[PDB]
Design a protein around this ligand. Structure first.
Ligand code: HEM
Ligand SMILES: C[C@]12CCC(=O)C=C1CC[C@@H]1[C@@H]2CC[C@]2(C)C(=O)CC[C@@H]12
Length: 452
């Protein structure tokens, strides 16, 4: 099988397609190109041939096998944000990625995942008592900012635990994400004309310098520390690995950065969307509340409770299916292969359009939000919200814990209303690297009225 997609008009196809990605945003471009051409098609980002693929089979092949455990993107852009051959998220050096990932994987499972269930709860509680910090005169809560701050507090107290300016760092993290998003697929040309990216360069510096402060203190505390065996955590594990000779200070520093931003970037937007679904789906809200009564009562949330919360689990999955935040995934082929029908050379970029795939394949009612879609056990090869295999989401397990943890603690205490008719469908979203609300609009606030 030869490959679908636009014509290579002797060097115009590549320029229009890259330009389309820049103009529309990565995610909407992927959808455009899938809807026009096949569910398996070719495009160019910069020069290199880049496949955009929504076919469940192809997705599964790619994530399963070890010769796709790379991503891609502008080397100059990645260098700019400090992700070029450094952390793990966009660390495309196979050997260096291989050696770094285990640190993340240890921290996001076993005992740390058990700790997380209560660290999440206490953080949100603590923030819901300080609801003045986020609420209007008119009673409107800035849910996004609330969520970001608890995601950051949570992440800190589990992986690092140094005191910090919660509010300031949340704003800096947003700046870093925006920068990352901007520069990820910008052509080299862009980086020559340098009053066009100095803007972003400063966002990165601001976050990177704020974290250098924290990791500096963390270093001091480790050197003085007496019973070092007792109080292990992600930051420490890394720092100790450097102190052997396994890791580089620069790399450590990026991994710490990357762990802190991860949840503020993604969890908060997912829970936001989930809250807007709860608002406009009262049928489901009851079921969830009934389940909480049955299972938890007015006891504190505990690790053993989370498996029992079957309805909420399905709610989360359906929210992530229907309204994804991470609707697409970037890989690269490290060896040649045949993939479904088509041949794929090494160095070929890949974009798995998992958000489109969740509407085209397995589910009874793909285009409407219903828990009937998760009434019958879903095979993991028809629904990958986190990905799987050697480079799947490192937080995939702990994330589900955290989402159940915060929804329970919030919905226990507050009914959630949404201003006007506003719903997830009527929210105006940007659809570039991730899929998230356009924050330059308004009517993104919510209202929290008590229970009992
Ligand atoms: C709703 C929540 C989340 C979703 C939907 C999500 C989804 C994803 C997806 C699709 C990937 C790409 C995996 C692949 O290429 O197959 C990914 C990567 C990643 N996620 Fe998440 N994620 C979430 C939360 C988190 C959290 C809370 C953390 C950390 C605390 C995290 C850390 C990562 C990391 C480190 C990677 C990169 C793995 C690598 O490239 O080696 N994620 N995530
Ligand atoms: C989940 C994630 C990591 C943690 C974080 O801080 C923010 C994001 C959002 C973008 C995700 C990324 C992981 C890698 C993804 C899936 C891609 O290959 C394209 C989009 C990108």
């Amino acid at each position: 099988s030869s490959i679908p997609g636009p014509g290579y008009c002797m060097g115009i196809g590549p320029l229009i397609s890259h330009g389309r990605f820049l103009w529309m945003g990565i995610g909407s471009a992927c959808n455009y190109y899938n809807r026009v051409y096949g569910e398996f098609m070719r495009v160019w980002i910069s020069g290199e041939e880049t496949l955009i693929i929504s076919k469940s089979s192809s997705m599964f092949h790619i994530m399963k096998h070890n010769h796709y455990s790379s991503r891609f993107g502008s080397k100059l852009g990645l260098q700019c944000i400090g992700m070029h051959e450094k952390g793990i998220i966009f660390n495309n050096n196979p050997e260096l990625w291989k050696t770094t990932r285990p640190f993340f994987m240890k921290a996001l499972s076993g005992p740390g995942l058990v700790r997380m269930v209560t660290v999440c709860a206490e953080s949100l509680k603590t923030h819901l008592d300080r609801l003045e910090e986020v609420t209007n005169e008119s009673g409107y809560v800035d849910v996004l900012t609330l969520l970001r701050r608890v995601m950051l507090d949570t992440s800190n107290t589990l992986f690092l635990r140094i005191p910090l300016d919660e509010s300031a760092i949340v704003v800096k993290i947003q700046g870093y994400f925006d920068a990352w998003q901007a520069l990820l697929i910008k052509p080299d040309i862009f980086f020559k004309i340098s009053w066009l990216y100095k803007k972003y360069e400063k966002s990165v510096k601001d976050l990177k310098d704020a974290i250098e402060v924290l990791i500096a203190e963390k270093r001091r505390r480790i050197s003085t520390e007496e019973k070092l065996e007792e109080c292990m955590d992600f930051a420490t594990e890394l720092i100790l690995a450097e102190k052997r000779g396994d890791l580089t200070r620069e790399n450590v520093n990026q991994c710490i950065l990357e762990m802190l931003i991860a949840a503020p970037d993604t969890m908060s937007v997912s829970l936001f969307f989930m809250l807007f679904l709860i608002a406009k789906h009262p049928n489901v809200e009851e079921a969830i509340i009934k389940e909480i009564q049955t299972v938890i009562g007015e006891r504190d949330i505990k690790i053993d409770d989370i498996q029992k919360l079957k309805v909420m689990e399905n709610f989360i999955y359906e929210s992530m299916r229907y309204q994804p935040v991470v609707d697409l995934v970037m890989r690269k082929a490290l060896e040649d292969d045949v993939i479904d029908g088509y041949p794929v050379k090494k160095g070929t970029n890949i974009i798995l359009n998992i958000g489109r795939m969740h509407r085209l394949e397995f589910f009874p009612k793909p285009n409407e939000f219903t828990l009937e879609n998760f009434a019958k056990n879903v095979p993991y090869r028809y629904f990958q919200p986190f990905g799987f295999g050697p480079r799947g989401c490192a937080g995939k397990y702990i994330a589900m814990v955290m989402m159940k943890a915060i929804l329970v603690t919030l919905l226990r205490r507050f009914h959630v209303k949404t201003l006007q008719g506003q719903c997830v469908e009527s929210i105006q979203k940007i659809h570039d690297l991730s899929l998230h609300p356009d924050e330059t609009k308004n009517m993104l606030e919510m209202i929290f009225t008590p229970r009992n």
